[PDB]
A paper describes a structure:
Only PvCE15 proved amenable to crystallization, and its structure was solved both as an apo protein and in complex with GlcA and GalA, respectively. The catalytic triad (Asp353-His406-Ser264) and oxyanion-stabilizing arginine (Arg265, oxyanion hole), whose positions and roles have been established in previous work on CE15 GEs, are conserved in PvCE15.
Attempts to obtain a Michaelis complex with the substrate BnzGlcA were unsuccessful but afforded GlcA complexes in both protomers in the asymmetric unit with the ligand bound in the same orientation as other GE-GlcA complexes. A notable distinction from previously determined CE15 members is the presence of an arginine residue in PvCE15 found at the edge of the binding cleft whose side chain, found projecting away from the pocket in the native structure, is rotated inward with its guanidinium positioning the glucuronate O2. Crystals of the apo and ligand-soaked structures were both of space group P21 and contained two molecules in the asymmetric unit with similar cell dimensions. We considered the possibility that these enzymes might bind GlcA and GalA in distinct ways which could then facilitate action upon backbone residues. To investigate this, we obtained crystal structures of PvCE15 in complexes with both ligands. Although observed to bind in different orientations, neither orientation could easily be envisioned to support uronic acid being part of a main chain with linkages at the O1 and O4 positions, as is the case in the galacturonan backbone.
Author numbering:
A (entry chain B): 27 to 161, 172 to 425
B (entry chain A): 26 to 160, 172 to 426
The structure:
């Protein structure tokens, strides 16, 4: 079945919908204080997303082993320190691990704020760093990481390849991390248990377990960032792991920050049928049934509150539903207001190349294609400066 | 809306290879060898799976609902029967939905009386051509209920129309009992809460709550029976309410007793797309994903063990998957064995008009159309006699 021919790109044809009320508890009590949000409502909304969309991840009692496998304090011609960190994902030392690559700027005062990116490609793609070689070449993804801009801001960048945690293909979860956490008599995750995206976002929490033990890293200023499917991951990492200080959604779109009820471009059915491994088994009940979601994506952004989040759209990325991305941001504003924080700063989706970033929810829709571009990183750094300086 | 009946496989050679989820294997890998392990560990796991992922949780009451005996005719059918109408209030609202239960008990019978509790497609007047009732038309469904045959066996019949509990149409659960059991911040069942079949089945449990207070009824000898969507319902009533002594599945088929993984005739997707109100939210995840079901329908029959179940198929009803219905029964035999009970008594699906009812699981596949006919009732009463008499 082709989902591209079924996509609506006509704003006039978007159906009627009502967002589920972010401030009304299941039992009817209206949240009017941050105390009511923190102690009652937020727990209900986290449980819905964990059970019905992303799936439960293993809850570890103790950290998994990490070893620093190589440091170069003089990387990039002395400008940076590069560390390679191996992060076990199981209590078997021959089981899957993350190869974490961390760049810290040399000669800045104070602990270093770090962007924890998750990447489509191996760590050697992040920068033409001559101390690395490639057995899809060295520095190939420089453009979507902008290491030089990050260093110039006094910030670090830690990345790993998501294929370390779970290969991005539908194999009935017999590769990657999943089979290590099955019970005896279990060949498959329960309907409420992690798919690929929850595994990747859990990966980012194992990366954070390392980063908070790093002397030069400010563990209170670790941002999470990803593009597209790794944008959906970064928002879930941010929502599920409140240690992260700032969330960057790069074109996260459908089942990221975009309102599902709009059914614009990609839909829940297009997503779950083309990528059956991404979300938990339970999520497949919402195929063609966005009406019956017990949440929408504005409540996922609400889980970030009061921490900042940057929503980035691309003007050509109609599949992502740029307007629905903005509206996922807008729908979270009532929760930020509990903390006496303002909103995006406008009522209508703003024009192209016009960032709003003076509130705790930042948004821009930029010219050109589905990507992370230098222009995006310009805006993310400017936003991050407001919190990290 | 795709015409699924056009697209369905009814060719036995094209049934996919599949493995049935093991009924005896607990989630943690422990195998059941004893009835004690079944009752204490495994049965509860399976019941929770079906309640969470297929039918949905129903309200649990702290007290029996209000009811009144509205009418009593101790001289019904020219003195052959006592007829009572019992109005059962399903909610806190007395202007809300009620079960209007009709109970026929044979006169001239001494003991407490065994009772078939049926759920019907149509109102009480359709059950029998009873001359003291008024308007399809009076006794239009007589052939599906055979009250004369039930009374002849010294058994009684209790029925109510399923529309009484929840209307059978997709109105987003804003009518029937559903909206009365919403929290103040809720406009729709949670994904793990009852759809229509679980409400209908809960309706039968409220009927049983009245029946057990009626001094003429033998509360230990109440059979549940339904046909097609009400067969699905009767099997769930029997699995979820252990008070029922005997379960009759009339052509219950897909998401009834038939094996889902055969993907033969009706499929999970055809079911949930055409009848989105029937099963809970969660069950929609299994649309075209039968291999990912954490169970199959042999485990639902297993929830009746050790109590008897009659599985009835029709020769023309290929939509229901008659061999799948046979194999659901076959698949539960390992659980009945823990109780030292036989199986159906044949290994492969028997030919038409060939009943097997010497085990705790009975089966026939009768000639003719999707229905309940006098033939079926003849077999059902012969089976009931084995348990309700000596
Ligand atoms: O990860 C990506 O690049 C994108 O892949 C597909 O286009 C998918 O439908 C999108 O949801 C996703 O954002
Ligand atoms: O209730 C009935 O008569 C039947 O109606 C339809 O055929 C439905 O698809 C069947 O599953 C059901 O058993
Ligand atoms: Cl809606
Ligand atoms: Cl888990
Ligand atoms: Cl490991
Ligand atoms: Cl799944
Ligand atoms: Cl009927
Ligand atoms: Cl009648
Ligand atoms: Cl026996």
């Amino acid at each position: 079945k082709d989902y591209a021919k079924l996509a609506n790109y006509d704003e006039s044809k978007v159906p009627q919908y009502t967002l589920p009320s972010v401030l009304m508890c299941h039992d009817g009590e209206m949240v009017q204080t941050k105390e009511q949000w923190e102690q009652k409502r937020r727990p209900e909304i986290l449980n819905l997303f964990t059970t019905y969309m992303f799936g439960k991840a293993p809850v570890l009692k103790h950290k998994l082993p990490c070893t620093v496998s190589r440091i170069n304090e003089k990387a990039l011609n002395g400008r940076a320190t590069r560390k390679e960190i191996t992060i076990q994902l199981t209590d078997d030392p021959q089981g899957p691990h993350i190869d974490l690559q961390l760049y810290l700027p040399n000669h800045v005062s104070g602990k270093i704020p770090v962007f924890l990116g998750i990447s489509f490609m191996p760590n050697y793609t992040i920068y033409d760093d001559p101390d690395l070689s490639v057995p899809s070449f060295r520095g190939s993804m420089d453009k979507s990481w902008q290491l030089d801009k990050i260093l110039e801001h006094g910030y670090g960048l830690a990345t790993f390849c998501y294929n370390d945690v779970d290969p991005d293909f539908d194999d009935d979860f017999q590769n990657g991390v999943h089979p290590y956490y099955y019970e005896k008599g279990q060949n498959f995750p329960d309907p409420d248990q992690w798919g690929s995206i929850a595994a990747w976002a859990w990966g980012m929490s194992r990366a954070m377990d390392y980063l908070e033990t790093d002397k030069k890293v400010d563990a209170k200023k670790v941002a999470v960032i990803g593009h597209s499917r790794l944008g959906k991951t970064a928002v879930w990492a941010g929502a599920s792991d409140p240690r992260f200080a700032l969330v960057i959604s790069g074109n996260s779109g459908c089942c990221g920050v975009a309102i599902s009820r709009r059914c614009f471009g990609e839909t829940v059915e297009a997503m779950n049928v083309r990528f059956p491994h991404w979300f938990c088994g339970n999520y497949k009940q919402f195929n063609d049934r966005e009406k019956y979601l017990p949440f929408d994506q504005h409540e996922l952004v609400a889980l970030i509150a009061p921490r900042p989040i940057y929503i980035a759209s691309a003007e050509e990325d109609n599949w992502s539903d740029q307007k629905g991305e903005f509206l996922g941001g807008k729908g979270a504003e009532p929760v930020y207001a509990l903390y006496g924080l303002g909103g995006i700063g406008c009522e209508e989706m703003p024009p192209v190349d016009t960032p709003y970033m003076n509130g705790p929810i930042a948004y821009h829709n930029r010219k050109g294609p589905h990507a992370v571009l230098p222009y995006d990183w310009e805006q993310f750094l400017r936003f991050a400066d407001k919190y990290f300086k």
